[PDB]
Structures are given as structure tokens and as C-alpha cells.
């Protein structure tokens, strides 16, 4: 069929199927099988349906795309508040309208007194945008990824306190940390990513089912210690 397109670093939706391994990972952000630990085989078919499928709700089964956890309107940030929340994310001022997991938690501006509770590892993203361009809309980038993962995302900082965004050899290699300080601030506090690979698999699963709404040329994702 299309063996010449498997792992060709270009997503081809005609080859994007579990049989063809999500176009050799090209359509699942380099994640081989986002459902590789999922105990039920046909969970991916139910991942995109906007309904709770309890048999697919385990962490191994990628929380059934949070449709058991966030069943109602709270599943998404309001689009009328989406530009405002991107503009006011991590600006050092508490904006309560953006202080929800679905809107990106205002980049933790309302929770400066809650200690960091980082997930294990670093989330590594290759974005086909130069570092300068990527950081020119970094608050928007983090806010949107925070909103998708339903947790707080920030750039990992180096010894000199600089964001770990490196040129890709064209693009960027972005290093992110996951701060679960408000994820674990209940109500259902079990729908929290314990590590960067868990988050990378979930993002791969969204890209595989074409339900990832991220306005950036995101090539791949992985978790690294």
C-alpha cells in the first residue's frame, strides 16, 4: 500500500491507521503506539468520540481523552476567552477567568504560594519554527499546551536562567517541565500526568486521531530524564 511513506518525517492521513502504525509514527508525533500499555485493543476508536468509555479510562488507555473526567463544558476553554488567556498567561498578575485547568491555570499567576510539584522528566518538542519566532509567542504556546494537557507547562530553565529552546538542524528543540501543583489540588486529582512520556503519548494519541488543535508546526514529542 504505502510502505515508502512509513517514517518519512511527513504525516500522510491515507496511511494514518493503527495497521500502518499511524504512518510509521509520522502522524502520532514519533510515538510508536500511544496505546502500547492499554489493556483493551480497540480503545483508539473510542478516543475521538466525545463520550465516556469506562473500559478505556485507565492511565494506560490515555484517560479516554479525558471524556470520563471532563464530560461537560469544562472540557474546553471558552474560545471567546482563549486570546485573553494567551495574552495574560504567566504575566505575573492573577486573572481568575483563566485560573482553570482547561484554560491553562493562568500560567500559575494565582498560585505563586503553592510549591512546584513537577512530573518526572522533561517534555521534548520539535517545532518547525526558529527559536526566536517560537519565543516571540511563548506565552501563547505554553498556555495552549497547558490547556491541552490540563496541567501547567513551563520552559525548563538552564544554569543561566534561560529557556531551554535550541535550534533544530529550520526549527526548535523545546524542553518543557510539567508542574502538577494545581492538578493535584483536586477534585479528581488522578487524571494527572506522572511523567513527561505519559504527556508525550497523550499528545501523540491526539495527533493520531486528528484532534490536536495546536497552531504550531509540532513535528515530534518525547519524554527524557
Amino acid at each position, epitope marked *: 500500500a504505502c510502505q515508502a511513506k512509513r517514517g518519512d518525517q511527513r504525516c500522510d492521513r491515507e496511511c494514518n491507521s493503527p495497521g500502518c502504525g499511524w504512518d510509521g509514527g509520522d502522524c502520532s508525533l514519533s510515538v510508536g503506539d500511544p496505546w502500547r*500499555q492499554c*489493556e483493551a485493543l480497540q480503545c483508539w476508536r473510542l478516543f475521538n468520540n466525545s463520550r*465516556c468509555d*469506562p*473500559a478505556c*479510562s*485507565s*492511565p*494506560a*488507555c490515555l484517560y479516554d481523552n479525558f471524556d*470520563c473526567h471532563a*464530560g*461537560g463544558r469544562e472540557r474546553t476553554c471558552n474560545p471567546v476567552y482563549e486570546k485573553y488567556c494567551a495574552d495574560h498567561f504567566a504575566d505575573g498578575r492573577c486573572d481568575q477567568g483563566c485560573n482553570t485547568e482547561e484554560c491553562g491555570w493562568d500560567g500559575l499567576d494565582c498560585a505563586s504560594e503553592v510549591p512546584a510539584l513537577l512530573a*518526572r522528566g522533561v517534555l521534548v518538542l520539535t517545532v518547525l519554527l526558529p527559536p526566536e519566532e517560537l519565543l516571540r509567542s511563548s506565552a501563547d504556546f505554553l498556555q495552549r499546551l497547558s490547556a491541552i494537557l490540563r496541567t501547567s507547562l513551563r520552559f525548563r530553565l538552564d544554569a543561566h536562567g534561560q529557556a531551554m529552546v535550541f535550534p533544530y538542524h529550520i526549527g526548535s528543540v523545546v524542553m518543557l517541565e510539567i508542574d502538577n501543583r494545581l492538578c493535584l489540588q*483536586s*477534585p*479528581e*486529582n*488522578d*487524571h494527572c500526568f*506522572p*511523567d513527561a512520556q*505519559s504527556a508525550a503519548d497523550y499528545l501523540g494519541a491526539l495527533s493520531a486521531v486528528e484532534r490536536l488543535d495546536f497552531p504550531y508546526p509540532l513535528r515530534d514529542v518525547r519524554g527524557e530524564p
Partner: antibody
Amino acid sequence: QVQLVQSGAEVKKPGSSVKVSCKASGGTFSSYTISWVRQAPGQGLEWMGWIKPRWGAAHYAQKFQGRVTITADESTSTAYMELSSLRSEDTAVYYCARGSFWFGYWGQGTLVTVSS
Amino acid sequence: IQMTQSPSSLSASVGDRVTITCRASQGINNYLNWYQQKPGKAPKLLIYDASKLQSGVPSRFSGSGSGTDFTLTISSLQPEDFATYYCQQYLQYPMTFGQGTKVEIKR
């Protein structure tokens, strides 16, 4: 403070059915899941399933498929576990717990005894 | 997923460092919880996600491990710590528990 209060101990004959209740107080059980876990006399713990009362979705352990019915009444902040075709092996303390994957909050446990 | 605890019974004294191990039949990453239970009482969550201490749980309780091997350590064992301890995987359905470690007083 959040508390889960269960119904009183039950005595049942084989083949009968039991319905145990669990009332949540303090928290408004709209944003949570209620789980059912049992413990036979000298034995360990066994998860039976769960319910998210906000949208009424339930999940069960395969071995309890068809015999267990988990429901909830939003207005009273109450979850129910109904177990049918009762056997002597069903004699246990049945716990109501909050959280799906891990449980911080527990009920006191309802003792059910199946004996002819 | 089969959870195996070791030992099943442990004898200790007040002040002792106590270690309880939990073996999962397959890798569960860090999706493991530890519970304490006293007779006629409901279990109590101590540790969630292998090493995270639940709020309101004394700091003398610590969890470690990843994959298939996990450890619950009680540093200066207090009188109120004599109870049964259970590990629990939360990676796949059904949620499964270890068969328990009873911690009794040495004499």
C-alpha cells in the same frame, strides 16, 4: 470537611440481592467519582468498580459483570451498589471510596453476610 | 496485574526502620499506591504514584521504586503504626491490591 457515610450492616440469604448506599457530605460530589471496594473476613481488598455521578457513567471489574449495579442520586449526593444472586463468598465489608485511580476518602464499610 | 507483597507478616518494635516491598507481575511505571489499615477500620491512603506522600500523612512514611519493584519505608515506627499495609496498582483495570503486610509487636 468531606465525609462518606454508608448504610448499616446487612444479613442476606443465598440468591437474594443487597443494595448498599453511600452519602457524601461536605463536598459537592459533582466534581468526583465514587468507588466500591470489598473485603472478605481475613482477606485483602478487591475493587468492584466506580461511578461519576455528574454524568452517571459507571465502570465495573469483569468478575462483577451482570451482578453489580452502581447508581447515584445527584440531589442527595448518594452512590449505590446493588449486588444480585448473592453467594456465601459475597460475605464481606463493602467500602465506598472517593477517587477513581487512588482513594484518599473512604466510607466506614457495610458488612454484608450471605447465609442460608 | 498480580501484586505480591513481602513479607506477609513482620515483627518490629517502636523506633525501628521498617521496609515493605511490593512486586507487580508487569511494569506499572510509577502508578502505585500504599494504604494502611487497622482492624475494623477502613484503609487510609499513605502514598500515591510510588513516592508522593498524601497530605496529612506523617513524613516518616516514604515510598520508592518504579516498574515492578516498590518499597514502603517507615523510619521511627510508632505504636499507632502496628497495622496491615497494602500496595495497589492503578495502571490498568481492574485496580488490584497486594495481599497485605501485617506489622505486629516484637516480644
